[PDB]
Symmetry: D2
Subunit: 455 residues, 4 copies
């Protein structure tokens, strides 16, 4: 439970996006006000005026990548509450207990539930906050607010959102803003725009509408060699059984993701303090050394499955060029021909060896899945009408350790501010975009944003 604020009142906090980062904040505030879990909150009566705006029509966790049988890449103990308080009612185990499913999950013997199940757990959590989440609202800008228009100090912010069904613009006033909008699809700048070129994030939701007949002999290419690329390549061979699929990667091979126990301690919540305090050179060097814990890597078991699928083809035909499904390593796409009335595009491939008697290959494909990752800079556009409130000379938003961005103290009241969530890897460590530290961080955020107010 959290009771709603009338839309027109001045909010204490408005959060943009209701994915796992914002949801853990919602959960942490709930637990902070629960006197059974927090002996102090016995004397507390007033609840902060909180509001969440989410672009999707309901809570959903990367729905375009809910590939049948995909598993989480992280232990369920790192759910949205347990590392902060195992007694919380929002643990994965308590959710299973409520679904009457806990003993059955115990016999699974896995730390890595299906992505479908973990979505249901977080959907189960999120439903308990329906009175403070406005769905179908896409935030478009954040503009400065002044209670006295003749004042030179901004003391609140107006968040504007467009309803995804009507297009109507709504305005909500708040003292503090959290931006937790995840990542945007990153496409190679050389690729043209075309309904047959689909980022991995829209795989489950748009590809079936393009290629309607599940038995047709489509040619489908996949670009990339990380977890998204591997899952799409593996699934397409099951989803379209008569298809010819081609995995295109600029590396020489899929490489295994690293979560060996010592290396994995960089994701511990208490490391965030050490990481933040290092110099920019140390943080950059560290992120590069631990690259294989998260980016451009595939879970070993899935590498092993794809290799076995390829081995079976080799058993049937010693000639790799005749295989139904193929991996073309150390290639890059140099041209995509897509104009004209035909269904298929023509992809031109050259070696990915640095430009420093080469051969060019062509493919005709009905679709190209682009599994080339994500950017986390969409907040720059959302915050562009308040960036003049930054300190003189900053070209980028600067979060402190507590995730609040730096602002000119003469332009912004100390009672107003903006916080960033999920886009702070460079200052806060490889865990920032993941589920890794969300439970603990939600607690930190509730202290940071509401600590004085609750006390």
């Amino acid at each position: 439970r959290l009771r709603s604020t009338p839309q027109d009142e001045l909010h204490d906090l408005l959060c943009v996006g209701f994915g796992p980062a914002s949801l853990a904040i919602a959960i942490a505030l709930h637990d902070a006000l629960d006197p059974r879990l927090n002996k102090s909150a016995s004397n507390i009566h007033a609840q902060p005026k909180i509001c969440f705006l989410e672009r999707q029509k309901q809570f959903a966790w990367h729905s375009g990548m809910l590939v049948p049988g995909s598993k989480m890449q992280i232990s369920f103990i790192k759910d949205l509450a347990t590392l902060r308080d195992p007694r919380s009612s929002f643990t994965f185990l308590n959710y299973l207990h409520q679904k009457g499913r806990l003993i059955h999950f115990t016999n699974l013997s896995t730390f890595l539930p299906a992505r479908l199940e973990f979505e249901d757990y977080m959907r189960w959590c999120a439903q308990q906050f329906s009175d403070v989440v406005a769905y179908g609202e896409e935030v478009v800008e954040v503009i400065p607010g002044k209670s006295d228009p003749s004042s030179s100090v901004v003391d609140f912010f107006t968040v504007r959102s467009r309803n995804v069904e009507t297009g109507e613009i709504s305005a909500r006033r708040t003292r503090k803003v959290v931006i937790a909008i995840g990542g945007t699809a990153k496409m190679p700048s050389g690729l043209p725009q075309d309904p047959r070129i689909i980022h991995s994030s829209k795989y489950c939701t748009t590809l079936p509408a393009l290629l309607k007949d599940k038995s047709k002999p489509y040619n489908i290419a996949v670009l990339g060699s990380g977890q998204s690329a591997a899952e799409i390549f593996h699934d397409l061979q099951k989803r379209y059984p008569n298809s010819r699929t081609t995995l295109i990667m600029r590396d020489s091979a899929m490489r295994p993701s690293d979560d060996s126990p010592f290396v994995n301690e960089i994701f511990n919540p208490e490391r965030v303090d050490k990481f933040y305090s290092q110099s920019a050179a140390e943080r950059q060097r560290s992120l590069l050394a631990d690259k294989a814990t998260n980016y451009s890597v595939v879970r070993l078991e899935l590498i092993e499955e794809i290799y076995n699928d390829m081995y079976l083809q080799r058993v049937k035909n010693p000639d790799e060029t005749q295989w139904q499904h193929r991996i073309l390593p150390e290639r890059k796409i140099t041209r995509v021909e897509h104009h004209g009335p035909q269904s298929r595009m023509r992809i031109h491939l050259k070696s990915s060896k640095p430009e420093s008697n080469d051969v060019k290959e062509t493919l005709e494909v009905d679709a190209l899945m682009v599994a080339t990752g994500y950017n986390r800079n969409a907040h720059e556009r959302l915050l562009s009408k308040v960036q003049h409130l930054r300190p003189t000379g900053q070209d980028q938003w600067k979060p402190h350790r507590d995730y609040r961005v730096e602002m000119d103290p003469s332009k912004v009241s100390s009672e107003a501010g903006i916080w960033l969530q999920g886009c702070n890897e460079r200052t806060h460590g490889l865990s920032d975009s993941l589920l890794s530290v969300l439970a603990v961080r939600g607690g930190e955020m509730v202290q940071s944003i509401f600590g004085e107010q609750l006390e």
Copy 2:
């Protein structure tokens, strides 16, 4: 947490033993009284008068088998509370959080903590009941009590215990008794008593006192082929590196324990209802069908290590009879000669099918456990049973049958941990303790807590 009852007052419940079974009852009672876990408890004034008697000097979980590196045989999710309420403060995960170790345990990636750790967890739990647990008290009998002697109705029980340090006998009066005393060492009937013949349960605590010099080339035999035998045999080779150890088993081979997921559902808490209601013939048949889940089986990984160690010996010497450590299958012990001043006993071996001798400094007897010590403990109330029973018969709720004309309905005796035959293969393990503790709190204190 739970406040004490004066020793001389009439108790609501007395529990004999403070192992995991009693600890689960204590925890569930705490949780039933916790307004965070039951809003239907914010309006509860009186805490029931509860008492626990434990013979050991502190909480301890088979400390004589705390073999270096030994692991749990069950997922940590089946702890003393989670399957009943994951919000409990007595979960394993919350314990880790209090110890500041939760994130580190996460990187272990295991469902099977070290036995040493799970002991500390339950010990951490047990400390919060220190005001209601009397340690160093060995219960010796349970005797019937009558508030009106002129009556034919037993309406309470007197539990007598001997202090392990002083020998003083104490008497406590209670309306209800729980017996949760675990198992006793099962010894083969043909073996004589000798300080060199030591049951597995006393391995860590007695053997080092006997074989003090860790460098001597002792001959040590081990009898059995279940989990206790496998762990002792493996550990002896590290503990006494120059020893010659011999594993003696009547089966042909160590066999893996079965916790494959469909088979493992017999341990689910909700199976207890189905199992309890089956006939005596069906109950026996299923326990025999599911034997490989618990008795006479070794965790697959431990077998593989032992086999690898033997394989390495074969690499060094192809003649098995010259090996330092040996496994002798399909053998039974027919005689042990032990009378004499000489240090070693002479073990005589025969085939286990329906001359070999070993001279040994010690024999570890890893032959399992019996669970009927309650029969001796309850013999002075045996006349209160319905006429014709030669055994104590627990109902589904674990309360034993008593002649309704001889025992008041407000008094009773419950059994815990010794009911495998009527309640399933999960009765003696950690499997259903969290849910079962909750059930017991309902059965014994439900009416009292509701009013």
Copy 3:
């Protein structure tokens, strides 16, 4: 190995050309190779050998080449390695010849796909095409007396029916090997119907019955061993909108046991120890080791099937609503199948000492290994008087009355001797070593003279 003209007196005739006989062909080849056996340089006389196989080409339980099915035994136990790793008929040399050895090395598995191990044995078998007559089903074995003045049987006539033409062919031999594997075991209570198909004919017969891979068929599977689990699992992929039901009289699928100490019962050198035990001892031993082979599923497939069921529970807590269901501790009491309805009605009762409407029932109830009894009925009078069963010696030669059968003639059994020779007899476990033993038993004296 060079062929023998059909009409000549053979030294050895083998009935069946599956893995059991193939191991013999391979072992005889190696016994004659001077690279492997120095003495064979002084042998130019090859024994007169011939193989009769009922299938049109070599094939290894092809009605069960289920997509993704794996071997249940390490590739080291191929058809030659445990006898001689230098043999050209090893699995590793096959991979090397196919140019696949390093790629297989990167698979890091001891358990090849069944498809692959079948191709490995097919590669072996093709090198014996001159002594294998395919499409020939042996129908009887009949005694021969070469000396009209004696009553002593000193050879055998094996007659076979060609499966395509029906012509009956007769071949004379001094010694016979029967290595015809197993026959489908069906529960005695089940009626015959084209919709009731044993697991051995799953891949080959069911597709002809259920042609539309997308139709919402109800398909039941009976049993809980490796075949039941592989079919139950595959049907959910093969007919994705189907409703499948696994019917078992046990309470659960149970894991197969190949832990290292238990598994030593399959070692080649155990056969001597096993054979010499009493009948009661051998019977007790087979019962104690049942979980090594019968009524058991590889753990990984159990875990997989359980995971699929768990996903259904996530989607719907009501098991009775599931697309795919397991009904444990059940038995089939009646099958209603006479009628125009496309579906049969299966009647279920509890198996301790509800109905389904199904388009098909897969019967995964295992195999019998006694078909040799009918094949040998015209020589049964040659057994020692008082024996009601064929008795193999340790060397697999069946006992015969020395006053009725010349010592130069005899009959050997392969694959049907579990009760006398151990759990390894019907499997691949000891075939390479046993191939060697058979060549010594059958050709030892002849190869020495030669």
Copy 4:
């Protein structure tokens, strides 16, 4: 069996070293001369005059690192013959069959034999070449020979070795030389030389002579975080149960070695052709991208074991600084005080980003160098093409020589030190079986074809 050549004759081939690389060459020549394996070998009555010089007294494979329980890091299929011919009598599987051990190894279900076992397998191979291997001979230089008086062309080489027992210098003449001397111990340039500073390569042989009492509470430090460091650190805690061990590494963590299936194909024999023909810049980039397949990495299972042991210490005491065994990451050694009459050295630590210990010994597990052939060949380096400062092998491992200074019938080959031109597999067992066969063609092809 290859027959020996008289010591004073002109050899066709002389090999420096008799480790696995040279042994694979010996095996491949044997197989090339076997008419059972190569049909042509029937019409060959001329065995090449071959000789091997090995400094150790008998075949031995990194005996200084035969840590109890250490395992191969490579599938046994990549033994010294199988990838070239599975029918060879020198396969690992055939060795097991000859030792009567094949079925027992099968029940192990592993591709990774114990290093102790794989050592014995290669020793079993090596015994069959005893007539052409001179043990106890340390090669010190290779000198050019001119058989034609007044000529300026080198057409043979003199290999000189010192007897390890007597110190006597022997001279052997050959037209072709193979250098296969493996790697030399790499020590950090800042550390001083002291009997207490011991490279990992001498762990099993030298540390026990230094720290003789296995029960004393030594402080033993280990430097590095690759496979050698991890095995020693792990072993020291078993070998010296009361010691205080400290792992010092400049990385932040031990990282797992990569042999996942697609990545691992860089080790396939046929990749050598692809790698060799790539540009110098492309080869350096590829070697950098695949580093985690071989250098500064630990087998995952071993990392997990070390992490488990540390977790247990955390269970016993939450204060990392009080643990018996400790890991100090992101440190480098800046100073060692060791000139003193006190038994312990003083190690000074600073951050390894761009504290003191007192220890009885420091194990330096800092890897290997492969450039000792430069010193062995220094008296023939004037024969390199003008302008080369380094030895350059062709694809077939023959080093380039000025065609006007060296007869085409003479030459020198390198084995194992050619990673920069031939791929990450060059120094390992990965391609030895195939490569030996290639070497037999390269060195003896014309000679065997004329025969």
